[PDB]
Structure 1
Amino acid sequence: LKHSISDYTEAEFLQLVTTICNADTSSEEELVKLVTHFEEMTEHPSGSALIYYPKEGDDDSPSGIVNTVKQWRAANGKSGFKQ
């Protein structure tokens, strides 16, 4: 259900990224847990920088972040989203 990227539809993953970007949690601990989860799921070498320290040119809206993840995984031999 939330063990890997392949367990998430793209819409479900967008929900997760949106919650993080809006800091929509009841505590700092809850937000850190979600960001760590995101890092483990994406396997992207930038880690939390995708959310907080975007590369010049990158779209750091929740939708932008999802597309950066989707494109990186597609280009680097990784499995993609469920449906």
Structure 2
Amino acid sequence: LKHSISDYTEAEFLQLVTTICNADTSSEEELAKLVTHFEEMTEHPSGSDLIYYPKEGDDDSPSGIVNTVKQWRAANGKSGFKQ
């Protein structure tokens, strides 16, 4: 459910990213925990920059971020979403 990215369907992963992008949490601490979780799931070298400091031309909407992660994982030899 929460141990690796392969435990997420794409739709569930979008829900996580949407929650982070909208700061839809009870406290700052809870948001920081969620962002750390995201970084551990993607394993992307840019870390939280994917959410907060996009590269030029990169779509930082929730759907945009999910696409960037999905493509990066696929291009770099890693397992993807459930189903």
How does the TM-score come out when normalised to structure 2?
0.99
Name the Cα RMSD after superposition: 0.3
Match of residue 64 from structure 1: 64
Tell whether 2:16 aligns with 1:25.
no
Tell whether 2:73 aligns with 1:73.
yes
Q: Which runs of 4+ in 1 moved over 2 A?
A: none
Secondary structure at 2:26 match in 1:
coil
% same residue: 98
Q: Deviations over 1:12-57 (max 9, x none)?
A: 0000000000000000000000000000000000000000000001
How does the TM-score come out when normalised to structure 1?
0.99
Note the residue ranges of structure 2 that are not aligned, 5 or more in a row: none
Pairwise CA distance, 1:71: 0.1
Q: Which whole-Å CA distance do the structure 1 matches of 2:45 and 2:69 have between them?
A: 11
The alignment covers a number of residue pairs equal to 83
Note the residue ranges of structure 1 that are not aligned, 5 or more in a row: none
Match of residue 16 from structure 1: 16
